Amino acid sequence: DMYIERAGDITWEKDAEVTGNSPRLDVALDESGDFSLVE
Amino acid sequence: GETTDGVYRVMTRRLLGSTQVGVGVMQEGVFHTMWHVTKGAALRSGEGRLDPYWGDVKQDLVSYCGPWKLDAAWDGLSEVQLLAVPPGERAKNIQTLPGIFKTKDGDIGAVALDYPAGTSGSPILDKCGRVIGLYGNGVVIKNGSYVSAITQGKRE
Numbered sequence: 001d002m003y004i005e006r007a008g009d010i011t012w013e014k015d016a017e018v019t020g021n022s023p024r025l026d027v028a029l030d031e032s033g034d035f036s037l038v039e
Numbered sequence: 040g041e042t043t044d045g046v047y048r049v050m051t052r053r054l055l056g057s058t059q060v061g062v063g064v065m066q067e068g069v070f071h072t073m074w075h076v077t078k079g080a081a082l083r084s085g086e087g088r089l090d091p092y093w094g095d096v097k098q099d100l101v102s103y104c105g106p107w108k109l110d111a112a113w114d115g116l117s118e119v120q121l122l123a124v125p126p127g128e129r130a131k132n133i134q135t136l137p138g139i140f141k142t143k144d145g146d147i148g149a150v151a152l153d154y155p156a157g158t159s160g161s162p163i164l165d166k167c168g169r170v171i172g173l174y175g176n177g178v179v180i181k182n183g184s185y186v187s188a189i190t191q192g193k194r195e
């Protein structure tokens with residue numbers, strides 16, 4: 001059996017750590033919900 | 040049980056100790072998570088029970104207690120926040136500019152942030168605090184890094 005525990009509010013945090021890049025990827029989505037890269 | 044709006048951890052005691060298998064959003068009395076987190080199983084919230092209402096393996100989404108409520112969309116231009124809830128760690132907001140998943144059926148936003156598998160279901164928000172989608176279904180690119188889609192459902 002699975003259970004849920006509150007972890008916090010959903011709010012935008014000003015001065016949050018800004019990281020990560022913005023890649024443009026050609027992808028395919030299968031019937032099982034799995035994404036894959038197209039080349 | 041607890042019905043307050045917000046982000047929640049999805050735990051299980053079926054494995055060693057108490058293990059976090061994912062995360063979800065409680066909004067308007069409806070719990071939202073990714074399908075691969077729960078496999079559509081019932082959830083417990085204290086003494087209460089949450090039953091699946093809608094779900095789709097291909098979209099990789101599931102709602103409990105009612106229909107999917109989250110309908111905000113990424114504007115395609117602005118930075119967003121991943122409200123990451125990692126296993127055994129406090130919830131933290133990470134700001135990023137999303138990339139794009141170019142598919143045969145249209146483009147989807149994508150956040151290039153790598154977190155443990157138990158972080159799946161963590162909401163991605165816009166500047167207004169609105170949930171524009173959930174983190175946890177994506178791909179692994181050339182260098183080994185993870186890129187999640189900004190996965191959003193449809194509000195009927």
Ligand SMILES: CN(C[C@H]1CCOC1)c1ncncc1Cl
Nearest residue numbers: 153154155156158159174175185
């Ligand atoms: C560690 N992974 C990839 C899984 C998926 C199948 O192979 C390993 C994540 N899964 C969900 N949310 C974030 C991450 Cl990074």
